[PDB]
Each structure stands twice: as C-alpha cells, then as structure tokens.
Design a protein around this ligand. Sequence first.
Ligand code: NA
Ligand SMILES: [Zn+2]
Ligand SMILES: [Zn+2]
Ligand SMILES: [Zn+2]
Ligand SMILES: [Zn+2]
Lengths: 168, 15
Amino acid sequence: DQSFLWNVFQRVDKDRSGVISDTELQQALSNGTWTPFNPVTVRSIISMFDRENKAGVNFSEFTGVWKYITDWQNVFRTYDRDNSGMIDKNELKQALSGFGYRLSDQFHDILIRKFDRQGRGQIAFDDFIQGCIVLQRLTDIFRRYDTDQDGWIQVSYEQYLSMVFSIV
Amino acid sequence: GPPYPTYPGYPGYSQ
Ligand code: NA
Ligand SMILES: [Zn+2]
Ligand SMILES: [Zn+2]
Ligand SMILES: [Zn+2]
Ligand SMILES: [Zn+2]
C-alpha cells in the first residue's frame, strides 16, 4: 500500500522538499505521552534508512521507516501486557528475552536507568526503540570478536580502543 | 548459542 504511504509522506514532508528531515519525522511520531519523540531515536532511524547520506529519507526509504516503526509499535504492545502505555522492568525482561538476549536481572536495571527519559522506572515507546538500537549496535561490535559465538571475547588493548572509538 | 540474537529476533536485525 504505497499509495497510502505516499499520502503519509506528503503530509510528513512539510516543506515539500521530497525528502523527510529529522525534524519533520519527529513531529509525525508519537511516544504515547506529551513529550516530543526522542530526537536521538529519530536521528538513528533516519541514519538506518537513509542510503544517500542526506540527513533524510525519500519516499522509498520512508517505506522502510514506516514498516520499522510499525513493527516496533507491535512489539511494544506485544510486551506491554498490562496496557500501561509504558514498558516495565518485568516487561523489558520478557521483551529482551523474547528477542534472544540472555541477560542478568540487575543488568535490566542498568538498561532502564540508561534509557528511561521519563523517570518512573518504566520505558516509553521512543526510549525503548533507542535502547534496543544501542544494544544492537554494541552487539555488532562484540560479535566481530566473538569468533566461536559463545559470548566471550579475548581482545588486545588496541582492539578494545577501536571498539570504543567506534561507539563513543 | 550466544547470549544475544543471531537471527532476526527484533526489528530490523538486518538493517
Ligand atoms: Na568467543
Ligand atoms: Zn522535507
Ligand atoms: Zn506496561
Ligand atoms: Zn506495567
Ligand atoms: Zn570461545
């Protein structure tokens, strides 16, 4: 239904540039609350789908964007089983586990603390995508060294530094 | 296997 998406695109593409910018995409997105969708999350979604390095998405790339956001709303709902419109510690544990991450209980606390911009120990839709993208990024860094894929790496000092230089 | 997904367990693992 590219026809629907094209109408969506046009509405979102406010300045009619033919490309959706970060500030245009943000206005179009809801995190379920009355705060603007996390601008860092917005910029990561643009980066993930922009193929032309233009700080924006054209129509074709927006179709990827729409599918990605929609796939995340569905996951966010699947795991928000108590219909708060926020994901909780227990719900996060079910989510990440469902995703195939094996992580200690106290680590889930570090994740909440790092990503919950609301401050109630519950994760909003925009912050949930964000934390999942960081995990994804960090894991890609890791699995470049986890050769026999057993979740242990042995790295030299210089390998470590370049790992971190490509995060921060 | 690893303590992390190695196949498309969340959106968009291949993106
Ligand atoms: Na290993
Ligand atoms: Zn535009
Ligand atoms: Zn909830
Ligand atoms: Zn809850
Ligand atoms: Zn090993």
